[PDB]
């Protein structure tokens with residue numbers, strides 16, 4: 001259950017800090033049509049690209065929100081930055097949102113390939129699921145998240161078939 | 177053993193990324209007398225101040241290294257920033273170094289106060305120790321760390337006595 005600690009790390013060290021300030025940052029970008037939620041991609045195979053635009057071409061980087069800074073554990077002005085993306089469908093802009101992967105999923109992946117970490121390659125999916133499950137239970141009950149955060153969890157068919165990440169996101173964008 | 181996953185998170189998500197670039201950033205500050213190692217504070221009571229200068233007055237913030245940026249998990253130009261500190265002894269500058277706490281120690285602290293986290297307040301010290309131990313074993317064997325990183329682990333007397341954080345750091349600064 002290494003996923004449990006990472007989910008709490010993700011909430012304590014990131015989400016509870018940035019989400020309360022997030023609407024304010026989005027408002028500052030819109031004035032001076034981005035959606036009001038942070039959308040978090042949670043691929044359960046724990047493949048996390050660093051370049052989101054390479055994962056789907058229909059996902060197109062737009063801009064950065066205004067940075068958030070804070071003094072953190074001895075680091076003056078530690079920077080929390082977030083990227084705005086446009087989602088294309090048949091060459092049309094179907095939506096705009098703050099979009100990112102959940103980074104700790106890379107930690108699950110890396111631990112699985114490092115011998116000293118003692119993490120089996122086979123357990124990625126299970127830990128990924130536990131991570132998503134733990135994170136969900138945290139955010140459900142979390143004050144910091146009020147209708148400002150959306151988890152997108154998905155398992156790719158993995159060469160069984162075609163998959164659209166942009167359609168996956170657009171679904172949640174539309175369900176609201 | 178939640179500490180185990182955090183130590184690997186700390187290495188995978190931070191240290192292995194920033195340490196290879198660290199000498200280059202310090203060289204860029206010195207030209208254009210900061211020590212060549214990143215010094216990581218590891219208080220075992222898991223108290224981590226956000227303002228290091230408030231933990232000891234003899235620790236005095238100086239400046240920031242040049243930022244490091246990279247595309248990370250869908251975030252364009254995620255910023256890794258580090259602070260330079262001066263260490264005073266009897267009103268003299270005794271040293272200058274890149275200094276910070278290890279943030280995950282705050283996650284151990286926060287988990288311990290959150291009911292849903294299932295982490296006893298009593299286990300902080302043990303998890304802190306396991307974190308330091310795991311991190312040590314990782315960095316010992318880690319390519320990314322070649323004489324660029326130093327762990328400072330300490331247990332305060334906790335009202336038994338006087339403690340000097342700045343002297344604690346100066347000791348390691350001098351042992352080299």
Ligand SMILES: Nc1ncnc2c1ncn2[C@@H]1CO[C@@H]2COP(=O)(O)O[C@H]3[C@@H](F)[C@H](n4cnc5c(N)ncnc54)O[C@@H]3COP(=O)(O)O[C@@H]12
Pocket residue numbers: 009010012013014015075078079080081102103104107185186187188189190191251254255256257279280283
């Ligand atoms: N620049 C930094 N300076 C000082 N410390 C740093 C810095 N970067 C990471 N660290 C910590 C040291 O390694 C630990 C694990 O790193 P992680 O990326 O794998 O998971 C993180 C990550 F997912 C997420 N997160 C936190 N901040 C951001 C962010 N700005 N942008 C997007 N995501 C973020 O929250 C998690 C935990 O956050 P931390 O508690 O701070 O511990 C970190």
